[PDB]
Design a protein around this ligand. Structure first.
Ligand SMILES: [Ca+2]
Ligand SMILES: [Ca+2]
Lengths: 215, 215
C-alpha cells in the first residue's frame, strides 16, 4: 500500500503524474466540497457527485419540491422560487439552479439528511403510483394516486375527416394516460439510479466521519 | 414532544396502546437487529428493512453475487453455495437464504459498507448495459456489455408450416434480445427502489451512530 502520488495529489498534479481532467479542484476545501457533523469536516463524495452531475442533481431537486407539496410543507413550497432577481427569463431551470447552489453550500449532515429523506419520499410516492396504474389493464387509481398522477404531470387529428377525430379521442384518452406513465417511469429510473449513487456517496462520507470523530 | 407511549414501547405493547402487527419484536436486541461502529451499537433501520422485505433482500443478494464475478472475486464467488448441508432440493433460493441469514447476523458498518458497494457496482453495470442496448435501434453492444448481457441472462413455432419457422427466427432473434432487456429493466427498477430505501435506512442508522459515539 505504498504510492507517494496518492498521498501527495497536488505534487502529482504539478508533475503531471496523473490525468485529472480538472487538476487541483480535488484539493479545494470549502463549504462547497465538504460536509460536517458536530463541526468535524470531511472532503465529501456527496459534494463531488453534485458537481460532476449537475443535470441529475437538478432532477432530484425537482423531486424535493414535489416531496414538500406531498408532505404539506406549504411555506417552503410557495417560497421555493423567491429571490431570483431577474425580471426576464434566464435559464429555464433558474430557480432550481439557485437551490442547487444552496444545496452545494450546505455542510451539516443534519440538513442533508432532510433533503434526501424528502427526495426518497417523492420517489416512493411515484413508484407506488405506477404500480397502482399497472395492477389492472383497466385503469383505476386510488384517490391518493389520482392526486399524485396529476401532480407529477404538471410539476414536470384525422385530417381526412376531422369529424372522425372526436370519436378517436376515446381511444386517444387511454393512449395519453399510458404515455404519461411511460414518461414518468423513464424519469423514475433515471432519478433512482442517480439517488442510489448519491446516497451511497453520502453513506461513505458518513463512514469517514465516523472514523474521524472517534478521536 | 411529550408522548409517554413512544418512550415506553414495551409498556405500550402490554397495554395494547398501539397496533403493531408483531408486538415486542421492535425491542428485541441482538446481532440480527443492530449494527455497530467501534463496538458502539444502535438498533438498526437497515436490519428492520431486511426482515420486513426478505424477498427484495434476496434480489439484492443475487446482485451481490453478480458484482463479485464482475469484480474478479473468484474464491468468494466459487464458494458462494458451499455449506448448504442438504443432498436434496429445499427452497429454490436456499443458498441465498443462507447468505441472507449471515447478512442479518453482520453487525459491523465496515462489512455492511462492502455489501452495499458491490450491489451498487452491479446495479450500475446493468444500467450501463441497458443504455448501450437502447442507444440505437440496430442492436450493437460494447465488448464489455456483450459480457454483462449474457451474465445477467444466466445468473437470473409455425404449426401450419413448420418450414416457415426457420425463417421466422431471424425476426424472433431480435424479439428475444429485446424481451431480455425488458425483463432486465423490470428487475433493475425493482432492485433500485429496494436499494434506495435500504441504503437510506443505512444512512439514517449512521447518523444515529454519529450521535451516539460523540460521548
Ligand atoms: Ca389500479
Ligand atoms: Ca448500442
Amino acid at each position: 500500500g505504498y504510492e507517494p502520488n496518492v498521498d501527495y495529489p497536488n505534487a502529482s498534479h504539478a508533475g503531471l503524474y496523473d490525468r485529472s481532467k480538472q487538476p487541483y479542484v480535488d484539493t479545494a476545501i470549502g463549504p462547497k466540497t465538504t460536509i460536517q457533523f458536530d463541526h468535524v469536516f470531511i472532503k465529501s463524495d456527496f459534494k463531488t457527485w453534485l458537481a460532476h452531475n449537475q443535470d441529475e442533481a437538478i432532477l432530484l431537486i425537482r423531486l424535493y419540491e414535489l416531496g414538500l407539496l406531498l408532505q404539506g410543507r406549504s411555506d417552503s413550497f410557495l417560497e421555493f422560487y423567491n429571490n431570483t432577481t431577474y425580471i426576464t427569463r434566464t435559464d429555464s431551470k433558474q430557480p432550481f439552479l439557485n437551490k442547487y447552489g444552496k444545496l452545494v453550500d450546505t455542510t451539516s449532515v443534519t440538513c442533508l439528511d432532510i433533503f434526501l429523506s424528502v427526495v426518497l419520499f417523492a420517489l416512493n410516492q411515484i413508484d407506488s403510483l405506477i404500480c397502482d396504474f399497472k395492477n389492472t389493464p383497466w385503469i383505476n387509481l386510488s384517490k391518493e394516486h389520482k392526486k399524485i398522477y396529476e401532480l407529477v404531470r404538471g410539476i414536470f387529428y384525422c385530417p381526412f375527416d376531422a369529424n372522425s377525430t372526436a370519436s378517436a379521442l376515446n381511444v386517444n384518452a387511454t393512449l395519453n394516460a399510458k404515455k404519461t406513465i411511460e414518461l414518468i417511469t423513464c424519469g423514475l429510473i433515471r432519478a433512482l439510479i442517480a439517488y442510489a449513487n448519491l446516497v451511497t456517496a453520502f453513506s461513505a462520507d458518513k463512514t469517514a466521519l465516523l472514523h474521524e470523530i472517534l478521536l
